[PDB]
Amino acid sequence: PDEPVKAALVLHVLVAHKLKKSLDAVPLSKAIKDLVGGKSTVQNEILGDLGKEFGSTPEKPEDTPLQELAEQFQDTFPGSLGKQTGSLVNRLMSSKMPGGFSLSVARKYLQTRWGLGPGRQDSVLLVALVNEPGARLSSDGEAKEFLDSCAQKYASGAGIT
């Protein structure tokens, strides 16, 4: 069941996080310059977080849509955690979660309750990153409806259990 991350599960997530939009809400099949409109600050900031650890920069950003970037990047993507792509995960993990909820106790619960594996537990924090709560969760038991619903949206992908 275990397989590494696809760039359409790690970087299509990130460009939906900057627009504060949903997964189906972006058209997914058009270029970055046409996505944001004419804001021209987030457009240079999308290439800011698309160029940190990711073999940093492609041959040209604004010619490919959100798939046709990633089909080029699969031979360059080693299945990394993310330096500051994956640091937005820790931002959710400290600002919106109760006291005593760093990534040690979370990654235990993703395996010992549902069963995902470390190759698939990267791609379930990112579907937690697109739907963040508006406030910090006031109890440890609030991770039983927030974090469990991320694996149910992950069940709309490969669909294991």
Side-chain angles (χ1 to χ4, degrees), residues 1-157:
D2 272 296
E3 52 165 30
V5 196
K6 174 50 196 214
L9 296 174
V10 73
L11 261 39
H12 168 237
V13 158
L14 200 59
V15 310
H17 186 251
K18 293 292 307 152
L19 320 170
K20 275 311 171 173
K21 288 179 48 60
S22 277
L23 274 300
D24 57 352
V26 309
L28 181 51
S29 44
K30 51 176 263 183
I32 301 190
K33 175 172 52 217
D34 314 328
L35 263 193
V36 296
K39 315 311 302 303
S40 161
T41 297
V42 57
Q43 183 202 348
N44 307 98
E45 209 177 357
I46 283 287
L47 57 94
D49 52 37
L50 262 286
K52 312 221 168 79
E53 77 272 11
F54 203 57
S56 293
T57 291
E59 83 300 334
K60 166 80 182 177
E62 294 94 9
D63 43 4
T64 76
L66 276 302
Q67 314 85 356
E68 269 73 6
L69 55 93
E71 284 92 61
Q72 174 214 340
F73 295 121
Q74 283 327 108
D75 305 348
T76 80
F77 184 39
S80 45
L81 193 139
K83 168 177 57 51
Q84 282 264 310
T85 309
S87 71
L88 272 298
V89 183
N90 312 78
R91 179 61 187 272
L92 157 74
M93 280 307 278
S94 73
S95 51
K96 296 297 153 283
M97 312 310 279
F101 205 73
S102 199
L103 259 183
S104 75
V105 61
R107 287 181 177 263
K108 205 83 51 193
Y109 177 74
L110 269 301
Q111 178 69 330
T112 72
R113 166 66 195 84
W114 275 67
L116 276 306
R120 292 176 160 271
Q121 272 178 189
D122 313 280
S123 298
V124 302
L125 303 149
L126 303 185
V127 310
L129 173 140
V130 286
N131 194 227
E132 302 215 1
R136 180 174 286 161
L137 284 180
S138 60
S139 43
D140 40 18
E142 271 271 2
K144 301 319 150 204
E145 59 269 54
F146 165 71
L147 183 62
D148 271 298
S149 179
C150 316
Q152 283 143 50
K153 306 198 194 76
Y154 194 80
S156 199

